[PDB]
RNA sequence: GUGAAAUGCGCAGAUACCGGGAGGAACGCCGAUGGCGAAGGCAGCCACCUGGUCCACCCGUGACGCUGAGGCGCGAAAGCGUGGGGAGCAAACCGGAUUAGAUACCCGGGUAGUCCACGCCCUAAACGAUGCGCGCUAGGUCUCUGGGUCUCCUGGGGGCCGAAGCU
């Protein structure tokens, strides 16, 4: 919420955006960012060196409440998903460990018209 | 590499119970695991999913493990 | 499924020799028996369409062997259906 | 009259003492609907998969008795009829599969 | 479900009533002290205070027990299910064991020589009332106190019922006939089940001479008026509305709530 | 959100994340070249009720068989009646985009419906486009399921390759 090393970072791959949500260990977000975020609109979200630079954003501005470790969470199949993940070990933040909890129905919800 | 059938004892897979020797067939995710890869056949395949579904709604076995580290 | 002495009750009843397991009229008390449990399950359980196509089939067989019989011995016929209660 | 193994999962966290009142409701329902009782197994406490009830863990109860096919519904509703009784399961019991022999 | 008329005249063509097939042969009410009287088509003021009413067709009024705590523990045996012209539901007349009688909302699945009881004790089923607190939560009831000990109020008519929501304080939160949701005290009784004589909501009244049975005076349209007698009253040829649509006093009647704001019982709502 | 966008949503605090709760629908992995059914069709798990079918033992009846106009029953989806249910999806409908136009393909919205009960409707690329029953005419391989001391033998299904032959 305001002061923790500790935390967990996590990834949103859409098709057309990319958002990093960094936390505490609890849940509750410390700071965010995304394609849009850091600068582009439309496509160029879902670009992959966005989602680097979305990570990379997120990163610093956890850094400043103090943040150095944490466990990454991903969600999604976008063009930038292991883009984030390896923008975030590379930003000098500790990955604890990487983890994917991309949901999935057991079949339920009828999709769109696609 | 090693079929899931040889690399256990004998045993019986109507037991919805025996979890150590169930949890050994149920992928790295929780997923039943592939019979081009039990060692299994036909009908021991089918009679284990039956079992294996039976314990995870007694709660023993999961549906569903996340991926870790990737 | 119907008890198994049940079914004795049956045919040891209607066999008209010891060990008539298969005579005409053993089968088809041997049939009004599962028809009559039939008739009853549909009696509630009236979706159950595809069971009421065995029941079809079943009420078909007995037709044939009393068919049959009746051609055979009207006496024996007589009796028999007299006897089950049959035919309305 | 038909075999059946009837497990039950119950509330982890709770005294011994209702507990034992939990388990005084179960051995009533089941003669009250004409279960002779066979062999049991009270595993008692167990590390189970997806939280059950908010809860990581939950007491096993495994009993195993031949009663009237045509009462074993009503009894699992009864069975479940209880809060601190987390799951109710009655299975028909099946000669063991040998694999892998 | 319901029966019909072969069209031997017309309006005959349409009218439907309920097969009274439930009703155990009982035309009698039970007497015994159950019945009293009823009448009056307007206030104690000479004044009418309530349109379009009188005609009905002289009923006694069969004595319900919508408490039902005062006999806790004592069971009793549902002696009959009768006909009540007081209410859309069908009554039934129960004996206590205690030798005492009383008559009770017949819920959907009674049947006469069935045994039933009032208590906290009480065996969760239909026609057994007990504090909410005792009903498992989930469970549809009907018959229920709004308050402790003030009697039942709530789902009495036919077919309706409430279902138990969840617990929270001394209160438990349920879904009303209307789909309302809101919190009742833990301590206000009801009986579990829903109400019987569902099919009731079918019945087709076939002709207006029936409507006048039930005691239901004809409903004169406002638009059919002159614009003394109502805001719709411009009467000048079949016309529409003078906008927007008016009740004979002046409030809006297409929308427009009408529940008090600041009532203290809203507190106890939601939705 | 897309080809790119726009409509739309969001400081009245949306998206992303966590916790508690409500409700409907559909059943991931097992799952297939698989299985069952007369067809339409049938997929989480449990129990009950029930149909068809296959193998063994050589036990029973003794031709009781086949087909079957009309009759009767079943019959995907959509659609209709009464009442209930309504998360997602979505004809119609509204808006955005594209275009010469766009009553469409794409996008944002969205109703009947899709779900349940009872009752109608009775159509289809209801297709193997191949009526049912029986007997007879090389084999090779693959698989599902029964019986038997079992690098195999013998029934019952599901595919492929192919004798003769047919076309
Ligand atoms: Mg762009
Ligand atoms: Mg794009
Ligand atoms: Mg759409
Ligand atoms: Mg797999
Ligand atoms: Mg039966
Ligand atoms: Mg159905
Ligand atoms: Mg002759
Ligand atoms: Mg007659
Ligand atoms: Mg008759
Ligand atoms: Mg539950
Ligand atoms: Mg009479
Ligand atoms: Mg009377
Ligand atoms: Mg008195
Ligand atoms: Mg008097
Ligand atoms: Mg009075
Ligand atoms: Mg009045
Ligand atoms: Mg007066
Ligand atoms: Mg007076
Ligand atoms: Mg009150
Ligand atoms: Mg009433
Ligand atoms: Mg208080
Ligand atoms: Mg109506
Ligand atoms: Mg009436
Ligand atoms: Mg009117
Ligand atoms: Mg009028
Ligand atoms: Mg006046
Ligand atoms: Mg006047
Ligand atoms: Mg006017
Ligand atoms: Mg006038
Ligand atoms: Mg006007
Ligand atoms: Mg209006
Ligand atoms: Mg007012
Ligand atoms: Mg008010
Ligand atoms: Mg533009
Ligand atoms: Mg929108
Ligand atoms: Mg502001
Ligand atoms: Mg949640
Ligand atoms: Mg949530
Ligand atoms: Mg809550
Ligand atoms: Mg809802
Ligand atoms: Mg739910
Ligand atoms: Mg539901
Ligand atoms: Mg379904
Ligand atoms: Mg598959
Ligand atoms: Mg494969
Ligand atoms: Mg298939
Ligand atoms: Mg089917
Ligand atoms: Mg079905
Ligand atoms: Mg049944
Ligand atoms: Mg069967
Ligand atoms: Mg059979
Ligand atoms: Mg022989
Ligand atoms: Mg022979
Ligand atoms: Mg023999
Ligand atoms: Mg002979
Ligand atoms: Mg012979
Ligand atoms: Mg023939
Ligand atoms: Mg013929
Ligand atoms: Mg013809
Ligand atoms: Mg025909
Ligand atoms: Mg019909
Ligand atoms: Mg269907
Ligand atoms: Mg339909
Ligand atoms: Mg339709
Ligand atoms: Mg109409
Ligand atoms: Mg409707
Ligand atoms: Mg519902
Ligand atoms: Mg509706
Ligand atoms: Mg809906
Ligand atoms: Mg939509
Ligand atoms: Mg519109
Ligand atoms: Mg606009
Ligand atoms: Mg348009
Ligand atoms: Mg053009
Ligand atoms: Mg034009
Ligand atoms: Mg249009
Ligand atoms: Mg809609
Ligand atoms: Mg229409
Ligand atoms: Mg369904
Ligand atoms: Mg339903
Ligand atoms: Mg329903
Ligand atoms: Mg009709
Ligand atoms: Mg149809
Ligand atoms: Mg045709
Ligand atoms: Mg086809
Ligand atoms: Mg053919
Ligand atoms: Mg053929
Ligand atoms: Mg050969
Ligand atoms: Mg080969
Ligand atoms: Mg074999
Ligand atoms: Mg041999
Ligand atoms: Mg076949
Ligand atoms: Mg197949
Ligand atoms: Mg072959
Ligand atoms: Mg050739």
């Known amino acids: ?79 930038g998903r292991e883009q984030a993940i390896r923008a975030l070990q590379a930003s000098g933040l500790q990955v604890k460990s990487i983890v994917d909890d991309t949901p999935v129905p057991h079949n339920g919800c009828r999709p769109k018209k696609k | ?36 890869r039990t060692g299994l056949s036909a009908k021991e395949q089918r009679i284990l999913a039956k079992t294996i579904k039976r314990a995870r709604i007694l709660g023993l076995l999961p549906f569903t493990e996340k991926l870790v580290r990737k | 499924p119907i008890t198994k002495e049940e079914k004795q009750k049956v045919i040891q009843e209607f066999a008209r020799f010891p060990g008539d397991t298969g005579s005409t009229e053993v089968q088809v008390a041997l049939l009004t028996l599962r028809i009559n449990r039939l008739s009853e399950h549909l009696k509630v359980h009236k979706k159950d369409h595809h069971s009421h196509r065995g029941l079809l089939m079943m009420v078909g067989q007995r037709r044939r062997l009393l068919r049959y019989l009746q051609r055979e011995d009207p006496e024996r016929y007589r009796a028999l259906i007299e006897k089950l209660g049959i035919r309305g | 009259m038909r075999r059946y193994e009837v497990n039950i999962v119950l509330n982890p966290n709770l005294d011994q003492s209702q507990l034992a009142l939990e388990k005084e409701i179960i051995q009533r329902a089941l003669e009250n609907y004409g279960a002779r009782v066979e062999k049991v197994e009270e595993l008692g406490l167990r590390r189970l998969a997806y939280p059950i009830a908010k809860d990581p863990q939950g007491y096993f109860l495994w009993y195993q008795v031949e009663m009237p096919e045509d009462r074993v519904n009503d009894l699992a509703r009864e069975l479940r009829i209880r809060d601190n009784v987390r799951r109710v399961m009655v299975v028909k019991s099946q000669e063991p599969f040998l694999a892998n022999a | ?102 008559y009770i909302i017949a819920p959907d699945g009674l049947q006469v020589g069935q045994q039933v009881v009032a208590g906290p004790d009480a065996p969760i089923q239909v026609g057994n009332a007990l504090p909410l607190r005792f009903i498992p939560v989930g469970t549809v009831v009907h018959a229920v106190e709004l308050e402790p000990k003030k009697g039942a109020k709530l789902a009495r008519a036919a077919g309706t019922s409430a279902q138990i929501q969840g617990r929270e304080g001394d209160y438990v939160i349920l879904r009303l006939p209307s789909g309302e949701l809101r919190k009742v005290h833990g301590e206000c009784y009801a009986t579990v089940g829903a109400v019987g004589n569902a099919d009731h909501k079918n019945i087709v009244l076939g002709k207006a001479g029936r409507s006048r049975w039930l005691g239901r005076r004809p409903h004169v349209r406002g638009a059919a008026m002159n614009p003394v007698d109502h805001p719709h009253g411009g009467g000048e040829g079949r016309a529409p509305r003078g906008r927007p649509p008016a009740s004979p006093w002046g409030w809006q009647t297409k929308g427009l709530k009408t529940r008090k704001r600041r009532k203290p019982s809203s507190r106890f709502i939601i939705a």
């Open chain 1, 1 to 79: 919420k305001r002061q923790v090393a500790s935390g967990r970072a996590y990834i949103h791959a859409s098709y057309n955006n990319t958002i990093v949500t960094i936390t505490d260990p609890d849940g509750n977000p410390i700071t965010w960012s995304s394609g849009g975020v850091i600068g582009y609109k439309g496509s160029r979200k879902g670009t992959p060196y966005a989602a680097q630079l979305a990570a990379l954003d997120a990163a610093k501005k956890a850094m400043a409440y103090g943040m150095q470790s944490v466990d990454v969470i991903v969600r999604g199949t976008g063009a």
């Open chain 5, 1 to 102: 479900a319901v029966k019909k008329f072969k069209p031997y005249t017309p309006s005959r063509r349409f009218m439907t009533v309920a097969d009274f097939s439930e009703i155990t042969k009982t035309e009698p009410e039970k007497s015994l002290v159950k019945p009293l009287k009823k009448t009056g088509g307007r206030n104690n003021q000479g004044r009418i205070t309530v349109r379009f009413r009188g005609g009905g067709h002289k009923r006694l009024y069969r004595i319900i027990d919508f408490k039902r705590w005062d006999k806790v523990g004592i069971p009793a045996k549902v002696a009959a299910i009768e006909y009540d012209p007081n209410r859309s539901a069908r009554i039934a007349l129960l004996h206590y064991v205690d030798g005492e009688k009383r």
């Open chain 2, 1 to 36: 590499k090693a079929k899931v059938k040889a690399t256990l004892g004998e045993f019986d897979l109507r037991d919805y119970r025996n979890v150590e020797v169930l949890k050994r067939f149920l992928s790295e995710t929780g997923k039943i695991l592939p019979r081009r």
